[PDB]
Structure formats: structure tokens, C-alpha cells
């Protein structure tokens, strides 16, 4: 299937305490593999997955330098943006950046991304063509003109389409046991009345990987998205994911409903149905 | 692998 590599950066200015808090995190698909936190004693890019610890000290040193360079650029940006938005030195402000790769089932480049946000809103993004910039407002125009004069897109074009995929391929190979696996969801179903003539049947999907999964009920053919309020997919904490859907119905009959689960780890889509 | 180029101040 498809895969991706993404880097997320957040810098928050704390005027009064000290330098901004900076936190960087890297992911391959739904797996975090590295992190950096400006407030940690470490002051190094650290691994968060076994397969990345195989990279030598040269790699780590390089990643550490780059990530710190990212941090200091965000520091300069925070000071520039106040100016642009004519804001004071008092409040706390946030700068976020994200970029990465998408490859298909053949591991070839599908698309790249490089986006930047200020105080939670889009500030400037690189378009799908990897050559044009989408500047949200007037301040962002100043930035797009300076990034155009320096050919930032062309540089990102080289990184997103070449380096990012080359390393995405490398990581998928080195961490094949983890990244190319597929954990099928373990499922079960509970049931207990809330009052006479009322009972909530609840379906579960646990320990599954990747995170992409569909959990829907059916009396028969849905036809449209049913009113069943499904909880947002969440991380188990051990690298897997979980998600449950629940329905209230007439106590008596309970064979009217059937929970359906669809995941990449399952060849045939599951169809659970039991009346406790 | 972090980007080692194309990263500039706004």
C-alpha cells in the first residue's frame, strides 16, 4: 500500500520565561520515529522507534544540527511575524511547519508537501505543483516574494521528490518488521440495558495498524451514512489503534443489527453480530 | 531525513 514520511514543527514564544518551546516530530505512516524538544536535557534528535537506532552517529549528528537550525529559523520568524501583523511583544504566538512525502504501493513519488501556519492559521503553503506558493494574506506575500527570489520551491522540489522518498524507501526497508506489517483488529461486542426496553450494543476494534479503518452498523443496506455516532479513532499507546461504535435499540429483538469492520489487515471484511 | 535545503526565514 501507500506510505509517507512527514515532519511536524511547533514553536511557541513564551515572552517572559525565555526562548520559545520547540518540538519536532517525525513520522513514517502512523509511526513516530524521531523527536526533538528544546526543553529536554538531551539537546539531541532522539529515536522513538527501534529501526532508526540502527543509523550511525553521523546521521544523528546531522539530524541534530538540522533540527536546531530549524528551531532558530522559527525564532527569527516569530520576531518577524509580530512585525508583519503589527502585534506587541506581550502575547504568546505559535509557528508551525509541516512537510513530507507520499509514495504509492510501488514506492514511487505521488506528492509532496510543505506548509507553514501562524497562530493556528495558514500563512504560506507550497502548492501541489511544487512550484507555486499559496499566500494566505498580505504579510504572507512579503514572504512569498522573498522565497521566490531565493528559489525555495526549487530546493523543496529537490528534497520532496528525491531525498524524502529515497529515505522513506530506506526506512521502509530497514524497519520492514514494523512499518510494512499489518495488525488486524481484534474485536468483541458488549451489551447491557440502560432501562426496561432499552439497550446499547457496542462494537469494538482494538490493536489494529495502520489507523485507517471503517466501523459501521447495518440492519440491512445502509444506503447513506447512518446516524450511529462513532468515536474518533484513538491511539492505544503501544503503537496500535482502537475505535468503537455504539447503537441503542429495542431490548427484545437484537439480531436486527450487525457490526461491520473493514481494515487492510483483513482480506475479507468482518461481519460481527451477537445477542448477549 | 530532515530537509537540509529550502528552509528559510519568513
Amino acid at each position: 500500500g501507500s506510505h509517507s514520511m512527514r515532519y511536524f514543527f511547533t514553536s511557541v514564544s513564551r515572552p517572559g520565561r525565555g526562548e520559545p518551546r520547540f518540538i519536532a516530530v517525525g513520522y513514517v505512516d502512523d509511526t513516530q520515529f524521531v523527536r526533538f524538544d528544546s526543553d529536554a536535557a538531551s539537546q539531541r534528535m532522539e529515536p522513538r522507534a527501534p529501526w532508526i537506532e540502527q543509523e550511525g552517529p553521523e546521521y544523528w549528528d546531522g539530524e541534530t544540527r538540522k533540527v536546531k537550525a530549524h528551531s532558530q529559523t522559527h525564532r527569527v520568524d516569530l520576531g518577524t511575524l509580530r512585525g508583519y501583523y503589527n502585534q506587541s511583544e506581550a502575547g504568546s504566538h505559535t509557528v508551525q511547519r509541516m512537510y513530507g512525502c507520499d509514495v504509492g504501493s510501488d514506492w514511487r513519488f505521488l506528492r509532496g508537501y510543505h506548509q507553514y501556519a501562524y497562530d493556528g492559521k495558514d500563512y504560506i503553503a507550497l502548492k501541489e505543483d511544487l512550484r507555486s506558493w499559496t499566500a494566505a494574506d498580505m504579510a504572507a506575500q512579503t514572504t512569498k516574494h522573498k522565497w521566490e527570489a531565493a528559489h525555495v520551491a526549487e530546493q523543496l522540489r529537490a528534497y520532496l521528490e528525491g531525498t524524502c522518498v529515497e529515505w522513506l524507501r530506506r526506512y521502509l526497508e530497514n524497519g520492514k518488521e514494523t512499518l510494512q506489517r499489518t495488525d488486524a483488529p481484534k474485536t468483541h461486542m458488549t451489551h447491557h440495558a440502560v432501562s426496561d426496553h432499552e439497550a446499547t450494543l457496542r462494537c469494538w476494534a482494538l490493536s489494529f495498524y495502520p489507523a485507517e479503518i471503517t466501523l459501521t452498523w447495518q440492519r440491512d443496506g445502509e444506503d447513506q451514512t447512518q446516524d450511529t455516532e462513532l468515536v474518533e479513532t484513538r491511539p492505544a499507546g503501544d503503537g496500535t489503534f482502537q475505535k468503537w461504535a455504539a447503537v441503542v435499540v429495542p431490548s427484545g429483538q437484537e439480531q436486527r443489527y450487525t457490526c461491520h469492520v473493514q481494515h487492510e489487515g483483513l482480506p475479507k471484511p468482518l461481519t460481527l453480530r451477537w445477542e448477549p | 531525513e530532515l530537509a537540509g535545503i529550502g528552509i528559510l526565514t519568513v
Partner: T-cell receptor
Amino acid sequence: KQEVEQNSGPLSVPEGAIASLNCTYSFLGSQSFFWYRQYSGKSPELIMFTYREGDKEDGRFTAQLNKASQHVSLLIRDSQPSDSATYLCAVNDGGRLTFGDGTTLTVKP
Amino acid sequence: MSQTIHQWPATLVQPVGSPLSLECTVEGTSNPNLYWYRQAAGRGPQLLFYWGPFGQISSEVPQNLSASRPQDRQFILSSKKLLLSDSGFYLCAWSETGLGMGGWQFGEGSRLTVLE
């Protein structure tokens, strides 16, 4: 050192000929590359940089990048005695430049 | 039209045990990355210090040297007591803030000869 390898020379090239300088790097994650020219007693001066495969020409100078073999070249067209110097290859291995020891070029008039 | 970098002094001859103070100044950019390299004869420049606009980035540790940046565009290399080993050609360089292609140029260098 061994992160960036260049023959040391002196490499002789007749005046008017093309001088070709080669460089091999070992750091897989290198994303940009540079060439400097350094005359005896002087600091190095930037010739070019490149961050993409293929050739990049600037006047008489042409830089070539082949990431597959981690090879970087520099061709100097119409060599003159004035380009006698030590040419340094540098790789950007993360926020900084790491240098080869250079190849000394001598162009005979 | 005018991005510049200069270092001083150009040449120094000092005895073992004396202090060192090399200066590097830049002009035409703000918040640049500043670097101190040292070059030995027959060799490529070797990195000593890599400072971003707000502090040192390299974890590198030269034996008898220290760097400081008392101003955005002013960079200093010091030593309280020089070692013979400290003879070399000290080079300062700069690159635009962040990680890009702007800059990457050296000052004229400071030749240091420490004598026994």
C-alpha cells in the same frame, strides 16, 4: 579526511584544455554540494553550489552531481594559467559544510 | 549589491602560552549562521564552531579554543593560552539563516603561527 575524497594532484593540464576535477563523498544524507577555489596564501572562494542531479554550468565552470555513486565533478573549460590553484569540494552534511582536502591544479602556459 | 564578510587580524605570530582574539564581521544580512573553520597546510578547512543566530549549534569541542557572538553580525574566536598545535589558517564563514543556498562565503582568513 574520508568523508570527502579528492585526488591531491598536482594535476597538470595544458593551457586551453578542459580540466576535470573529481570528488567522492561518503555521507548518504548530503543534500547540497559546493566547489571552492583557493589560491596559495588565500582563503577559498566560492565557485558554485548545486543541489540537484546532473550538470550546472556557470561560465567556464561546470559542476556535475551523481547521487547514486556519490560523485561530484568540476570541469573547467579553456583552462588558463590563472586558474592554477587548489580546488576544494565540500558537501553539506547538515547545517554546515564538510571539506575534502582538495586537488591542486597546475595549468602550463 | 553588498553582502560582505571580513576578518582580523590577517596574520599573527605569537608565543606559546599567549592569548588569542580573532574577529569576524558580516554586512548585508541579518541573523546569519556563522562558522569558524581552521585549515592546516595540504588540508581542507576543518569546522570548529557553527553558530546560529541565537547560539552554538555544533556540539564540536576544540581543545583550547572558544567562540562568542557579542552581536548579530560580530563573531569572535578566543583562547586564554595558545598551544603550538594552534598554528593554522583560521577562516570565518556565513550562510543565510535557516538551511539554504544563500551565502556560504569565507572571510580572508587569519594566519596564526604559534612559536616555541
